[PDB]
Amino acid sequence: PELEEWIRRAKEVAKEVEKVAQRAEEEGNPDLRDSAKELRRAVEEAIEEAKKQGNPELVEWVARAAKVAAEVIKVAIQAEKEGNRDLFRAALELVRAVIEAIEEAVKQGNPELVEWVARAAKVAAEVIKVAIQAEKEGNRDLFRAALELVRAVIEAIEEAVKQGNPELVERVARLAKKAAELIKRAIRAEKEGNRDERREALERVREVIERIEELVRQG
Numbered sequence: 693p694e695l696e697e698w699i700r701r702a703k704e705v706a707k708e709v710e711k712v713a714q715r716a717e718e719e720g721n722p723d724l725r726d727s728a729k730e731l732r733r734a735v736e737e738a739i740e741e742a743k744k745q746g747n748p749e750l751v752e753w754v755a756r757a758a759k760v761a762a763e764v765i766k767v768a769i770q771a772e773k774e775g776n777r778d779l780f781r782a783a784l785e786l787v788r789a790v791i792e793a794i795e796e797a798v799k800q801g802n803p804e805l806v807e808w809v810a811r812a813a814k815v816a817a818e819v820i821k822v823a824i825q826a827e828k829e830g831n832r833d834l835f836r837a838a839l840e841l842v843r844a845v846i847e848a849i850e851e852a853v854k855q856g857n858p859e860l861v862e863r864v865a866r867l868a869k870k871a872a873e874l875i876k877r878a879i880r881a882e883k884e885g886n887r888d889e890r891r892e893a894l895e896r897v898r899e900v901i902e903r904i905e906e907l908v909r910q911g
Contacts, residue, residue: 695748699739702755706735709762716769724768727787731761734791738798750803754794757810761790764817767824776827779820782842786816789849796853808861809849815868816845822875833890834878837897841871844904851908860911864904871900 713728735758742750768783790813797805823838848864878893 695743695746695751698748698751698755699743702735702739702751702758705755705758705762706732706739709735709758709765712762712765712769716765719769719772721769721772723784724765724772727768727784727791728765731758731765731787731791734758734794738794741798745801747801747803750798750801750806753803753806753810754798757790757794757806757813760810760813760817761787764790764813764820767817767820771820771824774824774827776824778839779823779827782839782846783820786813786820786842786846786849789813789846789853793849793853796856797858800856802856802858805853805856805858805861808858808865809853812845812849812861812865812868815865815872816842819845819868819872819875822872822879831882833894834875834882837875837878837894837901840901841868841875841897844868844901844908848904848908860908864908867900867904871897871904874900 709728709732713725713732716724716728738754739751742754764783764787768780768787771779771783790809793809794806797803819838819841823835823842826834826838845864845868848861852858852860852864874893874897878890878897881889881893
């Protein structure tokens with residue numbers, strides 16, 4: 693029944709995805725509608741396959757990944773409404789990346805990849821929300837820092853999934869979490885009227901992002 697519990701939660705996520713698909717349709721966004729359709733399909737098939745395998749951890753992680761992707765979609769919808777196609781596309785690619793990670797990992801029978809990707813995506817989703825606020829706050833510095841961080845995570849998901857290496861995703865997720873905390877420090881730096889520290893945090897975050905990119909590109 694534990695597996696079943698996770699299945700019900702996965703179905704509830706799928707219900708939320710369908711509701712999102714309907715809203716996306718209603719907002720005049722067939723791109724998001726379609727991405728949501730693929731998300732829904734992916735969830736349904738993942739539920740089916742994982743249920744047939746008997747891997748409740750897989751079901752859980754897939755469900756969480758799907759939930760993250762759904763939140764990314766909600767963010768994409770908001771980004772679209774705010775007139776930010778860059779963020780719309782970043783979120784779309786993140787969602788696609790998560791969806792493929794789900795599909796492939798389920799096909800592999802590798803629940804860890806799904807987990808780590810889901811955690812990385814969750815961090816990236818929070819970073820994207822920060823980027824949106826950052827766009828609204830008049831901080832192109834923070835906008836760009838968050839954008840590059842999200843990009844690094846997306847590429848990490850894409851690449852690690854193409855590799856089939858879940859550890860890479862993990863290490864990236866931990867790095868991204870670190871970058872997120874550096875961004876939070878940057879936010880505090882922003883609040884205190886300390887441009888030196890603001891720049892310091894910006895540079896630390898940038899260092900982490902490029903370091904993520906380089907470590908990820910080799911392995």
